[PDB]
Ligand binder design. Structure first.
Ligand SMILES: Nc1ncnc2c1ncn2[C@@H]1O[C@H](COP(=O)(O)OP(=O)(O)O)[C@@H](O)[C@H]1O
Lengths: 602, 457, 140
């Protein structure tokens, strides 16, 4: 049989090919003399239709189309970290090095990992010749980075007994590090495995999620928490801040590694990440280190060929599942699933398939469903026990800014967390622009055990916060018809603490040194003071409105204007300059100042 | 190497439908190759192969299909994609939509031929744009600042003075050499002369190239008009280190050509009947911007677009919104009050302002001033909306100060002469003399250190 | 503003041949010496019996004068002098006045904006009305 067929026809990112009898659907296929990369989307006889992961302009009828047998797949091994890859796994740093160009050439075949690098390999010592071994077994560490120890492990399809294991030493992506036997058949392995991106990497179990995905943003971490192992969406119109949330999680979170997935995103975003992340630093064990060591970027900028958006999203999650199997609490920024759905619209349009809503294919809901649900907290495969997790955050971008959007409508049926952004907040430069009325998190019932163990006071505060923030909108619909003179003193206090919680708690200028991040202790300290003022002010009115000596919101403001100013000032406390005990001591002094002032009013 | 093989020419037109002409018996069609058509009367037209299938090539004809004929039409297949002759000699010249000369000068001598599609700038080589351009316009330089190599459109309602604003940017823009690519799609002649004349009035004409496609020129040429402009901008910037600014005028009249081609091809329709690829097509224009490693060039893009029925959420502005580094908004609510330039700061943002401002770029206060100006302007609109229902008697003294802020702000900060250049420093001082309307402690967006250095003066 | 190259050069030939007809018409004797000299560059190509094809090739080659703005202004100047002379046919004016009025038009910014053209339009309306006027007090 022929290893290649021939291009029967072309239409944008679709290429039909003749002499393709015996092709497999979703087989990876090279197209054209320049060896474009693509994948078979349909079969129609002795003939195939290929989605092409580069722009086809220049492909000719009768060009060679070369089969490969393999489905779309990623190389996994040492040297992933800190790199940037396109949607078809080509490492952009090595493209830049080999070509010296400002642009990615069509037809580049650069190896997904730098097979020239001798990495330091540390075999597990527990393994030896004749030992039994199974998919997910860690045969050795590689000291890839000062942060991330890479934990090499047997490919999930593989099982057998150890024929050979390499001694401690330096090796690369072609050096044989392990050899198995199964059923009398030998199987050599290098440090690099390869995995089909469309097939889920399996696990021993998917557990419930029960540890907060700590995020720099107050409103997120306090009022709508994500969880390590949970999904999330950030639907927002253009310029709403969803990309800055996505940056902020990546820059500052308890995630052990981040895969960021620039699917159809503006190019300066990748430049901003690559500018900021080598210079920003975390700390481990008394060593400060560059956060890029704990990341990888999958990039596919908005002008790169539409099809590669699909391969990009599947690459980002497949890398995430690889690091999950190492026991890292992975996080993965799916930086726009609507621009992904638009790529599925494109291929569907070329295939002439029947569209569902707004031109999207009917399988969009099914593709999105089978993607976000690749998240979880997992008992890994294999023998040394690990609890890895993937957490997936999807920056949905609704066309026209309207949540009736089919991508949003599907996404909300799948994700356990909704951080719906409001363009009206973004217009006011209120950021992060999270609408607290429509947003929700389903994980609160699981996380409440963690808050009970570490922050027992918090669940009352979170409840009072959400309620005050709802009562504001309940009052607004009245005030807009009659004016503020209609309000009772309880209502004025409600609107004032809502204004504190809105303008000084929920508001956070994430590029500034003081709002860069916010520890939970700072976050609860701020919210605790604000709600302590609410309860004390409310109590003071309720205590005295039974008499002619009635306290009022204006009486409180005129006696306690400095306290309102101190409460507003709480956001400016800086974790680099101020210790947790120092910030907490200042907040205790605010509680005492409030109590002594209210004791003088009552 | 040059394409040496002799060109074919086909009479095998075998169908015509809308703007398409379908050839047959074609020997190894190439997707996206260009075909020249000779009509029966000897008229020349040009077209791109949109689909190929065995012997068939579906050619879209740029200059329209009227007069194409199933027996006598002759298609010269060029054997390659739409390359454009480019040179630095294109500065100080004027071109039709398809890049033919119309300044009565000769045909361009190619310093090279470039592919009109450009190439995807490698995200690793791209440099994050941060060196500020002063446009001189306070509503930009103060609150929406533009970095060298930013892409940021000007959105307008129809009939607003957005042409005069773009002209002023092409009169006053500079850093804290420079050259301009200008393109206009579906422009009326009464405005083509305005742009051409303005580059003469500013004395700038020697450093600018105008690609003009007018509303009665062929609609399909608008698809390639901004791509030619960007290809010239790439040659000037990345090959020749020029600090290029690209003006794309009425991207709406470009987007209408996408909607037409979409309907003519029967492409899957997104919102309002634009093709599903509308976001990608707009990206293929808008991403050719920003600095690249080792090259001192820096393509800045200021697209301009008339929003249909003034609707911000319309697909043209909205998809542009997702792609661009924030957006500048021009408003009837300012223009009817004669507030030139009618830039409404509030709905505007610049994504790059975050790093284009503060010490080494601009005065230390600038970022804090910008945020507090948004806060006060926004609260001013909110108390104005309150007054319009319940009257000034319901407003507190502080609410009336926010209303006064909005009035004093529009009359001083936004209001500027069409030829008046204001430095960022002067814009910031106007900002502070307005912010001083409130007591120091009311400025809740600004840190106490910035207040102590800049509030009392 | 512009035309197809074939159209543009065909307009250039049209201006050149027309200027020659106007020169022959205003002056069948070469009496308007300074005027004739100021068009010699265009007149030669039409006083010579060149074929339309030969002058069109000479226009494409840049051998003929070929700026339509210059040719139109120069053509307008000659025709607005011819229009004067024709409009006063029963009162043929002095050669020195013709070349003096020509110098004033050669110096002028824009003949269509000039009151010179306005006066001639008023003269033309009055003159043209008489051409079919019946015996009647107003007409007489
Ligand atoms: N958290 C924030 N803190 C400060 N400024 C913000 C914040 N979120 C949004 N803004 C400003 O608004 C810009 C637009 O939001 P961004 O996420 O970048 O765009 P988009 O919503 O389209 O993805 C930001 O780049 C930043 O300049």
């Amino acid at each position: 049989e022929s290893t290649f067929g021939y291009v029967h026809g072309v239409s944008g990112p679709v290429v039909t090919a003749c002499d393709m009898a015996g092709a497999a659907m979703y087989e990876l296929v090279r197209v054209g003399h320049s060896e474009l990369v693509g994948e078979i989307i349909r079969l129609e006889g002795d003939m195939a239709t290929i989605q092409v992961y580069e722009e086809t302009s220049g492909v000719s009828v009768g060009d060679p189309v070369l089969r490969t047998g393999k489905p779309l797949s990623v190389e996994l091994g040492p040297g992933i970290m800190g790199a940037i890859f396109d949607g078809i796994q080509r490492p952009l740093s090595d493209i830049s090095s080999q070509t010296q160009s400002i642009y990615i050439p069509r037809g580049v075949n650069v190896s997904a990992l730098s097979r020239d690098i001798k990495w330091e390999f540390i075999p597990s010592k527990n393994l030896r010749v004749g030992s039994h071994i199974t998919g997910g077994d860690i045969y050795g560490i590689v000291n890839e980075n000062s942060l991330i120890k890479h934990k090499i492990m047997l490919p999930p399809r593989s099982r057998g007994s150890v024929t050979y294991i390499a001694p401690p030493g330096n090796y690369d992506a072609s050096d044989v590090v392990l050899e198995l036997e199964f059923e009398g058949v030998k199987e050599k392995l290098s440090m690099v495995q390869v995995w089909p991106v469309r097939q889920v990497r399996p696990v021993t179990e998917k557990l419930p999620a029960n540890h907060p995905l700590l995020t720099g943003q107050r409103v997120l971490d306090a009022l709508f928490p994500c969880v390590q192992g949970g999904t999330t969406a950030i639907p927002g119109a253009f310029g709403c801040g969803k990309t800055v949330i996505s940056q902020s999680l990546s820059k500052y979170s308890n995630s052990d590694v981040i895969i960021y997935v620039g699917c159809g995103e503006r190019g300066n975003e990748m430049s901003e990440v690559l500018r900021d992340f080598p210079e920003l630093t975390m700390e481990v064990d008394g060593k400060v280190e560059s956060i890029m060591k704990r990341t990888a970027l999958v990039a596919n900028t908005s002008n790169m060929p539409v099809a590669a958006r699909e391969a990009s999203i599947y690459t980002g999650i497949t890398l995430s599942e690889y690091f999950r199997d190492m026991g890292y609490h992975v996080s993965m920024m799916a930086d726009s699933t609507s621009r992904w759905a638009e790529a599925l619209r494109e291929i569907s349009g070329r295939l002439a398939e029947m569209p569902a809503d707004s031109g999207y294919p009917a399988y969009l809901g099914a593709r999105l469903a089978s993607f976000y649900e690749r998240a979880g907290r997992v008992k890994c495969l294999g023998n040394p026990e690990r609890e890895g997790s993937v957490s997936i955050v999807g920056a949905v971008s609704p066309p026209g800014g309207d949540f009736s959007d089919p991508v949003t409508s599907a996404t909300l049926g799948i994700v356990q967390v909704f951080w719906g952004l409001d363009k009206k907040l973004a217009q006011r430069k209120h950021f992060p622009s999270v609408n607290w009325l429509i947003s929700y998190s389903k994980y609160m019932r699981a996380l409440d055990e963690y808050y009970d163990k570490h922050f027992t006071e918090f669940v009352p505060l979170r409840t009072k916060a959400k309620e005050i923030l709802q009562e504001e909108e309940d009052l607004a619909e009245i005030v807009q018809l009659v004016g503020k003179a209609s309000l009772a003193e309880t209502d004025k206090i409600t609107l004032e603490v809502a204004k504190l919680i809105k303008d000084d708690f929920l508001q956070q200028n994430g590029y500034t040194p003081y709002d860069r991040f916010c520890p939970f202790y700072k976050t609860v300290g701020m919210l605790s003071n604000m709600i302590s003022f609410y309860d004390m002010a409310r109590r003071a009115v309720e205590t005295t409105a039974q008499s002619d000596n009635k306290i009022t919101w204006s009486i409180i403001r005129e006696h306690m204007g400095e306290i309102l100013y101190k409460l507003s000032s709480m956001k400016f406390k800086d974790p680099v300059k101020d210790g947790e005990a120092k910030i907490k001591a200042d907040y205790a002094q605010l509680l005492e100042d409030m109590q002594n002032a209210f004791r003088s009013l009552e | 190497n040059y394409l040496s093989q002799p060109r074919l020419t086909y009479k095998t037109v075998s169908g015509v439908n809308g703007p398409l002409v379908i050839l047959d018996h074609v020997k190894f069609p190439r997707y996206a190759e260009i075909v020249h058509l000779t009509l029966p009367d000897g008229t020349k037209r040009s077209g791109q192969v949109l689909e190929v299938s065995g012997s068939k090539a579906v050619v879209q004809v740029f200059e329209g299909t009227s007069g194409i004929d199933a027996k006598k039409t002759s298609c010269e297949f060029t054997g390659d994609i739409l390359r454009t002759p480019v040179s630095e000699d294109m500065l100080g010249r004027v071109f039709n939509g398809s890049g033919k000369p119309i300044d009565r000068g000769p045909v361009v001598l190619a310093e090279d031929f470039l592919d009109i599609m450009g190439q995807p700038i490698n995200p690793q080589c791209r440099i994050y744009p941060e060196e500020m351009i002063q446009t001189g316009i306070s509503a930009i330089d103060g609150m929406n600042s533009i970095a060298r190599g930013q892409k940021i459109p000007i959105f307008s309602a129809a009939g607003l003075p957005h042409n005069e604003i773009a002209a002023q940017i092409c009169r006053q823009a500079g850093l804290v050499n420079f050259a301009i690519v200008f393109a206009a799609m579906g422009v009326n002649m009464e405005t083509a002369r305005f742009f051409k004349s303005d580059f003469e009035e500013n004395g700038s004409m020697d450093n600018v190239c105008l690609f003009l496609n007018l509303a009665n020129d062929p609609t399909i040429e608008r698809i390639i008009t901004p791509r030619l402009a960007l290809t010239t901008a790439e040659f000037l910037a990345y090959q020749c280190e020029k600090h290029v600014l690209v003006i794309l005028t009425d991207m709406s009249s470009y987007a209408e050509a996408l909607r037409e081609v979409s309907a003519a091809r029967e492409e899957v329709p997104g919102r309002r009947g634009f093709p599903g690829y509308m976001y990608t097509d707009l990206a293929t224009i808008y991403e050719r911007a920003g600095r690249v490693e080792g090259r001192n060039g820096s393509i800045t893009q200021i697209p301009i677009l008339t929003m249909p029925n003034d609707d911000i959420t319309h697909p043209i502005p909205d998809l542009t919104g997702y792609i661009t580094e924030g957006q500048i908004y021009v408003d009837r609510q300012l223009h009817n009050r004669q507030i030139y330039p009618p830039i409404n700061v509030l709905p505007s943002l610049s994504r790059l302002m975050k790093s284009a401002i503060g010490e080494g770029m601009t005065r230390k206060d600038h970022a804090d001033v910008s945020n507090q100006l948004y806060a006060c302007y926004a609260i001013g609109k909110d108390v104005q909306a309150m007054k319009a229902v319940v009257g000034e008697e319901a407003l507190t003294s502080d609410d009336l100060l926010y209303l006064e802020f909005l009035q004093k702000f529009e009359k001083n900060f936004i209001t500027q002469g069409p030829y008046e250049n204001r430095t960022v420093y002067e814009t910031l001082d106007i900002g502070w003399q307005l912010l001083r309307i409130f007591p120091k402690e009311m400025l809740k967006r600004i840190p106490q250190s910035t207040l102590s250095e800049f509030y009392p003066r | 503003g512009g035309l197809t190259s074939e159209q543009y050069h065909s307009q250039v030939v049209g201006k050149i041949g027309y200027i020659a007809r106007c020169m022959q018409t205003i002056d069948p004797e070469n009496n308007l010496k300074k005027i004739r000299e100021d068009y010699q560059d265009v007149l030669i190509w039409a006083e010579k019996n060149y074929r339309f094809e030969e002058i069109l090739e000479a226009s494409k080659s840049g051998k003929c004068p070929n700026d339509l703005d210059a040719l139109s202004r120069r053509s307008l100047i000659l025709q607005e002098l011819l229009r004067l002379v024709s409009s006063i046919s029963p009162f043929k004016m002095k050669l020195d006045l013709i070349e003096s009025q020509y110098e004033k038009m050669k110096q002028h910014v824009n003949l269509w904006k000039s009151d010179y053209h306005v006066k001639l339009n008023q003269l033309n309306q009055l003159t043209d009305y008489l051409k079919n006027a019946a015996p009647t007090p107003k007409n007489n």
